Design a protein around this ligand. Structure first.
Ligand SMILES: Nc1ncnc2c1ncn2[C@@H]1O[C@H](COP(=O)(O)OP(=O)(O)NP(=O)(O)O)[C@@H](O)[C@H]1O
Ligand SMILES: Nc1ncnc2c1ncn2[C@@H]1O[C@H](COP(=O)(O)OP(=O)(O)NP(=O)(O)O)[C@@H](O)[C@H]1O
Ligand SMILES: O=P(O)(O)OC[C@H]1O[C@@H](O)[C@H](O)[C@@H](O)[C@@H]1O
Ligand SMILES: O=P(O)(O)OC[C@H]1O[C@@H](O)[C@H](O)[C@@H](O)[C@@H]1O
Ligand SMILES: O=P(O)(O)OC[C@H]1O[C@@H](O)[C@H](O)[C@@H](O)[C@@H]1O
Ligand SMILES: O=P(O)(O)OC[C@H]1O[C@@H](O)[C@H](O)[C@@H](O)[C@@H]1O
Ligand SMILES: OC[C@H]1O[C@H](O)[C@H](O)[C@@H](O)[C@@H]1O
Ligand SMILES: OC[C@H]1O[C@H](O)[C@H](O)[C@@H](O)[C@@H]1O
Ligand SMILES: OC[C@H]1O[C@H](O)[C@H](O)[C@@H](O)[C@@H]1O
Ligand SMILES: OC[C@H]1O[C@H](O)[C@H](O)[C@@H](O)[C@@H]1O
Ligand SMILES: [Mg+2]
Ligand SMILES: [Mg+2]
Ligand SMILES: [Mg+2]
Ligand SMILES: [Mg+2]
Ligand SMILES: [Mg+2]
Lengths: 899, 903
């Protein structure tokens, strides 16, 4: 007939069995799964939050760190000093600062003003204001972080409820507050939950610590999870700590069969009704009020105090968790119950004291059992990830209920071992709270922010502003004008070369021509059939022929014999071997022409370098190889640059096309100039197409104040050291070499590739256009970026791959902007020479970089639009190669060699 | 003996690298198998050479297809145009009429504009010769090139292959381009409803006859295959039920050098002279456009070495194209082969001897046999995949087949079918030859896509009713604005459905309010009792306490004494709870319903709104029913000072700190607004001095008819079935009690019409309340995978499939979007009126807002704000969320109460 048996029955639904706890554990096991999944997280109640902490301390941290801890029973500020090598050591000093009701419940401003004022005082009294120490912030609330130094508040919990904070990044709110008080500056470099710092504190001393557990004012746990299971973070290597935020378990109604009427009543008086329901059955802030609610009910039904209620009894908060602890002490518990109940006014009896003990017992054991169940789900997940029959792991713990209750921990530990027999757990109690740990994470964040600081300074040398880009355009304009004028031309670096093509296609062109395409990525021999009139037709055919690097860099004479010999192969293939036919020679090197069919090679560019060609007439060299072969005669009527033939191609259909552009292996442009402006050729009537040879802009030092160390290495290790400087910042032959030298540096500083500069990274050309374009594609995910780097031969991690991509982007973006600033100049010079206010002009373009890069063309058109706002430029991609155009121009010789 | 080599043995040695054994083909098959898998996964598709592309064709014809439609066939050897009729449920079987339009080189190679103008021209003529311009026939477009499709009537050209190379088309959607040509012409109208691949058309043509058909196979000018994949394995398509045909684009197998070990010098020289070098490399080893050049290349090199023609080489033998694949066919003929070889070679000028003919036949046989072996290896991979998706030991399947080479070569199909069967011994395959083209099949697709678009068109037509144009929104503001005036005018309180009720709060807070107040919160989601301590010091502070109390609907819609007797047990309980029973205390009553007020501390209930309907309330003073229940209790005592609308309480809360906040907005269970109005304008309150907060009772807008215009079938149904038919009409197109009832009604309809829920209206869909503010908020969130939208709906009890889940989410956004715009028209009026009232040119104002819908909905608050900024462009309105309920605000008003009193 005992009183204890009655209560057991009264509170039957709080006495959880092992079967119910095994059931709780399975559900928690599914919530974790839900929260890690990209599919189910948006609705999961157990947020499974990434912490950006990747391991427990490794003994290599050193420094002097200020650390804040706000969110649990006290607000503290610690100064943690840690040094190794030598002798043994981590020193901490800290201060508790009060935070009243008006602060925790006020505006977010008032709270952070409050925080920055205790920080100021803290450093003030120790005199460390100027010692500029990195700050670590233990803020114990669920925050969404994409990096270690952002903390976006998802939702208040426990006792805090300040306006203006939820949804905001509280490190910017903190900075704002500190900024607001000019007193000092603070480098806030990390935010961490109290579970993670706990784990990090315990992990400094115990290498198998993989869990951090808080059973205090609130409850939570964090654990080391595999990167390849955390869908919301990109990577699959190693592990990252996760903040479960288990307090929220049941917030969608899944524990409704466990929660009692006392739990529903507590929730309604709470400062967050509906939320953190598992936490409300477990943590210190609630248990006292839970028993109080049960005592009022038993009291109202005459089962306690022979039914006497007092106001005190009925008052929220009048029974603490510290009274539930005192009441459960072995020798003194009953003496403590009488004093306290006596203080509440119910004139307690000895039976009432044993009854109030029994109730305290069932509430706190229900708490103990519940966290055994969610903690064991975590251990079953750790053990499953590991692949092992048994699991040995250490859980770092902290919290006031955990520390001060005289039965809890023991009860908790026993249940755990029953629920999870295949796991052996050591509990390590955080004697001095979480500062050591937070400090340890602050040290790693700090070393990383420094490495970020340095990559950004290197990369910012590639950044051009509007104002910068307007100065390049303006220099380009001053340079076209010196190459054009008779007095300045010989010393000019941008030669403004006459091509002798005097108009765009006029619809009369007719005939069957041969063409050559030499100087881009493939050499071709072409046959183009053009028919003017009613039904206008163009019929093309072509054959690719390789040219060994031996030949490209052999003798002029091996080069041209090799050329004619594929011509001869090609005339067989088209069934036209015998007849004498006219040919247009698209040769994409700077040529000084005195007519359409003459072209003296000024200098090689790009990868070509045959001997005895520079200084000669390439039409001559070709005609000596034909005669030399003595197989067929040919009639070479025209030497053409790929820009001009590209413009001619695109203008066959588009009369507004007066500009050509190439961005492929090299970069260059042509455009229609007025003859009055071409002082180097006699005559003022009409126009002429000018082959700018814009690659050579900067060859007199005029872009030096924008060229980088890496641009100087690529130029100095080139086949034409000192020349085609602009092209060298823009085209497909050189961008990858820029990117490769940047990566070489970064590797030597340890930022990439584990600091190991390999044989792959030392090989020239590893980053060709095709790979540069893919790596940067919005079509690819980091995963596929990494796989590209690996097939190139690089030992690249996910972090490495994120940085290679950023690099590629910086260099490719700068190339499109530099290319846009020069095109800007050209269109402005045409518009404004014509007296026009608004020019619409079409540019015909070709080249593999331009065709294959996913960003270049968009950024370039944007640049042209921003710097030359009175020109409306259209870019028309030529899909057929340069041949049609050389063919159209070739028809113009013929006619003129035919007079 | 010791056998000595003859021509034939020597040529097998010369061309060893083309003679591929069962071991090498099993290696290729397995490579192809990994490339398909590679193509279907999201982790490797972006760099895959086998694109494994989605076609939107979910199955082979089932025989319900009926109707009449055109069908364009572009990209094989002939540009054809068909007419296809079927409708068996009534008599007449499929019947096919076609033409064939000569398309010249200069077109296949000119601009895309020339190309599509020519196709447009041909369609026109073909429509006149038949006299059908005027019928409105659905059009199908078999376009045999790799294309990215996000739906059946889009086809973005990835790349040209085979013979075509028209500029300005790649990257562009050939449907756009065709329409654009058609448009420019004028002759007729074309409804193009679908683009398929000649593989998919083949599979469907053959499936129409054999329901076992799962593969479409093309070995003609080009080669490709398509097959039915489990939507579970198509990562680039969102969905996991049933199947979808995949068009592999196996021609590009090996682009990336993964076939560089089987490719030879002959295949590397052919690539050098083709229209797309570096592309379609496996196709270049197999298909009709290439087999003839491949033989010619071998013959030139054999002639140069003296193995053929005693070393003679003529200019014909050296010329691209002079030996074609129909030459390879004629030479491989059983009887007449060697004699065909004689003629063909003599026209090449080479004076062929009889040895030379036997040699050439043999090279032709090795080249064409390698091609047949290759397609057997890659089909072998597709068949094994099919067997592994079924989970059987054996597979049974039909392959539908088309292409000139397969049809005309005398030996090919035989050796193909044979090597195939030997490579896949556990499969029982039938090969069905699409005797007459891919048009029957394309027509069957066009027919399923046409029916689907009629549904889509009818869903859009219902939904367009919820779409509000900027001048309609503007007319709604002007309408809101005219009702404001009416409700203020002493003589117009009638068709004054918008009452403009005076709150008797004459100013916002003024740093002097001080004290300990009880407050009550009745009308929203929770009934709460509060303790609010305000101190004015040099330390301005606010301390809040509250407790939620349920109201069991046996009190909600029960009596008034029984409703207030309850409020007052709960007040009694809250004072014990807070430890303050005893002290006579002042109370602020936030009561979220329309009331006529003669002062701060009295208010007669005008009507029940929202969910409340307790009897003996309307026409009574609530502060009087409150006072009675307190006397019935004859326990404690308090001093009721103020009765306040949630609206006025939220504004005041928010203004406790922000002097700009002169407006209050509620969007939760119901919707309402308040603002500070000038007293010269409040005609019903004597005094022309100062200001006054007006509780608009804005939800009643449209109660006289002035929104009838924008109200839909679904809005009238929600209203007719409500506790208060005829009223709070504007509130009924906005708030969270009513939004999901509109959606529910939309879904009921669409389900009767068969567009959704397999057409069954279930007990779940017919339950009021199913679509709560919490699920509408989740359903419409932007971080939602479609798998999750489905899960939720199934959680609710709805048997939703992927596509149902797509239209339920589109229905929710349409409703919730109209709700935020309508709200913003309303707020645009309030803020333009306050500006106007003050003869200002520009107004800066802040609205304090609360409400579960405003808080939880992903888009609502962002669209309302946009709306207000676009319709009152001279006002600059900031909105501040009330994070802790309007109790602070009611308390502040209770502070003024007590002042203005006990003066
Ligand atoms: N699952 C449970 N939930 C609530 N109360 C429980 C539960 N299990 C046991 N109790 C109570 O806990 C007390 C004893 O537990 P405890 O002393 O910690 O265990 P023990 O030392 O292993 N066994 P014991 O000999 O009973 O003391 C008694 O008051 C039991 O009624
Ligand atoms: N794997 C292979 N690759 C290339 N050529 C092959 C291969 N296997 C066999 N051949 C040749 O294929 C020919 C045999 O063709 P096959 O279809 O098996 O019979 P057939 O002689 O053409 N039949 P028939 O019509 O009765 O005369 C011989 O000339 C073989 O040298
Ligand atoms: O203060 P409690 O809620 O009892 O929790 C105790 C612990 O809580 C954490 O919030 C703090 O990071 C710890 O350093 C503190 O020791
Ligand atoms: O091949 P790239 O160097 O990228 O340049 C690509 C283009 O190069 C020019 O030099 C050729 O004349 C064009 O016909 C070719 O389309
Ligand atoms: O025309 P071929 O390339 O030889 O291919 C044969 C088949 O080609 C497809 O592209 C057409 O859509 C079919 O109707 C045709 O019968
Ligand atoms: O509860 P809802 O109807 O969503 O609107 C929420 C709000 O509405 C009001 O009626 C209450 O006075 C506010 O304190 C509450 O925050
Ligand atoms: O402080 C203990 C726990 O308290 C609450 O659960 C917080 O939401 C959580 O972040 C914290 O770790
Ligand atoms: O091919 C693009 C350009 O490459 C280099 O710039 C050549 O000097 C130039 O003439 C050619 O136009
Ligand atoms: O026409 C047969 C096949 O030819 C080509 O390979 C096309 O790329 C393909 O889409 C078509 O199915
Ligand atoms: O609760 C928001 C609004 O709900 C209904 O519209 C009530 O009639 C109104 O008084 C309240 O302000
Ligand atoms: Mg991951
Ligand atoms: Mg026990
Ligand atoms: Mg001149
Ligand atoms: Mg899928
Ligand atoms: Mg008045």
């Amino acid at each position: 007939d005992d009183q204890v048996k009655k209560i057991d029955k009264y509170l039957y639904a709080m006495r959880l069995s092992d079967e119910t706890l095994i059931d709780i554990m399975t559900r928690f096991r599914k919530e974790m799964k839900n929260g890690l999944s990209r599919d189910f997280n948006p609705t999961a109640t157990v947020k499974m939050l990434p912490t950006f902490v990747r391991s427990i301390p490794d003994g290599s941290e050193k420094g002097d760190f200020i650390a804040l801890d706000l969110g649990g029973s006290s607000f503290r500020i610690l100064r943690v000093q840690v040094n190794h090598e030598k002798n043994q050591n981590v020193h901490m000093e800290s201060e508790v600062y009060d935070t009243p009701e008006n602060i925790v419940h006020g505006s977010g401003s008032q709270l952070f003003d409050h925080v920055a004022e205790c920080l100021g005082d803290f450093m003030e009294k120790r005199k460390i204001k100027d010692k500029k120490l990195p700050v670590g912030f233990t803020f114990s609330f669920p925050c969404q972080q994409s990096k270690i130094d952002e903390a976006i508040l998802i939702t208040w919990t426990k006792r805090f409820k300040a306006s203006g904070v939820e949804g905001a990044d509280v490190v910017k709110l903190l900075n704002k507050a500190i900024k607001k008080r000019g007193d000092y500056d603070a480098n806030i470099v990390a935010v961490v939950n109290d579970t993670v710092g706990t784990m990090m504190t315990c992990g400094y001393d115990d290498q198998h610590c993989e869990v951090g557990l808080i059973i205090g004012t609130g409850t939570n746990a964090c654990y080391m999870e595999e990167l390849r299971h955390i869908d919301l973070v990109e990577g699959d290597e190693g592990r990252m700590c996760i903040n479960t935020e288990w307090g929220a378990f049941g917030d969608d109604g899944s524990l409704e069969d466990i929660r009692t009427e006392f739990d529903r009543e507590i929730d309604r008086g709470s400062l967050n009704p509906g939320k953190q329901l598992f936490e409300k059955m477990v943590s210190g802030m609630y248990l006292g009020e839970l028993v109080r609610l049960i005592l009022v009910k038993m009291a109202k039904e005459g089962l306690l105090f022979e039914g006497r209620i007092t106001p005190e009894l009925l008052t929220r908060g009048k029974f603490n968790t510290s009274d539930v602890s005192a009441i459960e002490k072995n020798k003194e518990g009953l003496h403590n119950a009488k004093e306290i109940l006596t203080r509440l006014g119910v004139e307690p009896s000895d039976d009432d004291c044993v009854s109030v003990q029994h109730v305290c017992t069932i509430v706190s054991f229900r708490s103990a059992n519940l966290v055994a169940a969610t903690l064991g789900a975590i251990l079953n997940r750790l053990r499953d990830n590991k692949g092992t029959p048994r699991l040995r792991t250490t859980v770092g713990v902290d919290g006031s209920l955990y520390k001060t209750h005289p039965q809890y921990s023991r009860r908790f530990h026993k249940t755990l071992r029953r629920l999870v027999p295949d796991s052996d757990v050591r509990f390590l109690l955080s004697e001095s709270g979480s500062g050591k740990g937070a400090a340890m994470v602050t040290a790693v964040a700090y070393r990383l922010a420094e490495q970020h600081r340095q990559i950004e300074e290197t990369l910012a040398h590639f950044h051009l502003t509007k104002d910068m880009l307007l100065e390049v355009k303006k220099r380009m304009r001053a340079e076209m004008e010196l190459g054009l004028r008779k007095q300045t031309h010989n010393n000019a670096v941008v030669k403004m070369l006459p091509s002798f093509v005097r108009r765009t296609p006029d619809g009369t062109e007719n005939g069957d021509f041969l063409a050559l395409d030499l100087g881009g990525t493939n050499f071709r021999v072409l046959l183009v059939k053009i028919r003017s009139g009613k039904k206008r037709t163009v019929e093309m055919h072509n054959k690719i022929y390789a040219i060994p690097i031996e030949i490209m860099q052999g003798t002029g004479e091996e080069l041209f014999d090799h050329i004619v010999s594929c011509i001869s192969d090609f005339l067989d293939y088209m069934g036209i071997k015998g007849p004498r036919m006219p040919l247009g020679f698209t040769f994409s090197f700077p040529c000084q022409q005195t007519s359409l069919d003459a072209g003296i090679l000024i200098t090689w560019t790009k990868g070509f370098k045959a001997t005895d060609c520079v200084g000669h007439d390439v039409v001559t060299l070709l005609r000596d190889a034909i005669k030399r072969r003595e197989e067929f005669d040919l009639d070479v009527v025209a030497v053409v640059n790929d820009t001009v033939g590209t413009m001619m191609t695109c203008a066959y259909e588009e009369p507004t096309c007066e500009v050509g552009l190439i961005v492929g292996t090299g970069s260059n442009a042509c455009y229609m100039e007025e003859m009055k402006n071409v002082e180097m050729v006699e005559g003022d009537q009409g126009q002429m197409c000018i082959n700018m040879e814009w690659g050579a802009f900067g060859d007199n030092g005029c872009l030096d104040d924008i060229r980088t160390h890496y641009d100087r290495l690529v130029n100095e290790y080139s086949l034409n050291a000192g020349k085609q400087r602009y092209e060298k910042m823009i085209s497909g032959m050189y961008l990858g070499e820029i990117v490769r030298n940047i990566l070489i540096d970064f590797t030597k500083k340890g930022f990439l590739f584990r600091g190991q500069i390999s044989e792959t990274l030392k090989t020239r050309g590893i980053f060709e256009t095709k790979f540069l374009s893919q790596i940067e594609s919005d079509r690819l995910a980091l995963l596929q970026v990494r796989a590209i780097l690996q097939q190139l031969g690089l030992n690249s991690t996910c972090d490495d791959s994120i940085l290679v991509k950023t690099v590629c982007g910086v260099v490719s973006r700068r190339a499109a902007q530099l290319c846009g600033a020069g095109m800007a100049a050209v269109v402005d010079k045409i518009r404004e020479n014509r007296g026009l206010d608004r020019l619409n002009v079409t540019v015909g373009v070709d080249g593999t970089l331009y065709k294959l890069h996913p960003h270049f063309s968009r950024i370039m058109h944007q640049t042209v639009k921003e710097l030359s706002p009175k020109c409306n430029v259209s870019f028309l991609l030529s899909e057929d190669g340069s041949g049609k155009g050389a063919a159209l121009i070739t028809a113009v010789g013929v006619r003129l060699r035919t007079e």
